[PDB]
Amino acid sequence: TTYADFIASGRTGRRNAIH
């Protein structure tokens, strides 16, 4: 599922800005 793919992406925690 899309949600499972979200979990698999590893980007489920706080996201950093590019710089």
Next chain:
Amino acid sequence: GHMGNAAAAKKGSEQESVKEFLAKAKEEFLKKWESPSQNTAQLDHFDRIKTLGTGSFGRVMLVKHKETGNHYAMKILDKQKVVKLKQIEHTLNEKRILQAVNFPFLVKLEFSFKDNSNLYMVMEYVPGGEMFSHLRRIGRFSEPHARFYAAQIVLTFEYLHSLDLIYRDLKPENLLIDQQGYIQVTDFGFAKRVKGRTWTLCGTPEYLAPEIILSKGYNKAVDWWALGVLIYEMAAGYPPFFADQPIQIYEKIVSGKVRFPSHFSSDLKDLLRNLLQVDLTKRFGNLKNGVNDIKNHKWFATTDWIAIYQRKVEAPFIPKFKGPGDTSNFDDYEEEEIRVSINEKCGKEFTEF
């Protein structure tokens, strides 16, 4: 047509009253923009309580004002680290913006000062913690809950854009929830006063508009794209474009092929297809009718914009608060000393602070 006479007259009057409000707000902003305030306290006026957040430049600490007992959030920036990371202008601009703006969903700067080592911005303490935390705790927000927060962002961007400020840092991590359940926006390090176009690559991958990724210049409509991403993530629990690595996220954004959960309403999907529009001649917020295309969309038909501004709407979530200075809605961070050198560092770079 879609409105009878009374409704049309009411909408027209509302829209003209917004213009009148914004014209006065701009006049007030420009006075403070040209004459900023500075040096309104010192470090030993405050007791340090707990670190609320840390990043490459510095950290944000819960503090208590000794003489009054009031709690505040103090951002501490190490001058040498700011110079090293090429953030001098962003740091000075953030302070300049915070001391000039005034809006119920924008955090207030209560004091600022500097010493040999650091810069200090003393802001309101917002005790409910980050929207990010609450969203991940419950998974997704129902559409009314998402809409309550979205409405506050629409009004805040309407205000900022009237001042020619582009925001560029929207995401749930950067939105705090106050004791009444309303949203506070705090971070202005990526904001810029822009009357036309600008080019800087900055932001967070999932929230970048296509025209920021691509080399072409862009305008304030990137913020309306970002609102689309926020609304999508609030209502789905995950953002519209994600992947293992940023370059793959960027590829998806510039295709802009967006798919929706089966529980999204048709009204929500229509709004999002018009915000997450790659074509700038079609993106809501960037057309002749401006922000009114958003505010008059069906998904917002139940939203009383004035009542949101007046904070008279009951919020969907009221944070638990156990007493003054309670930090139970924030994550724990390592506690480090606040060192102040005997020698002044980077004095000339930070004269304006």
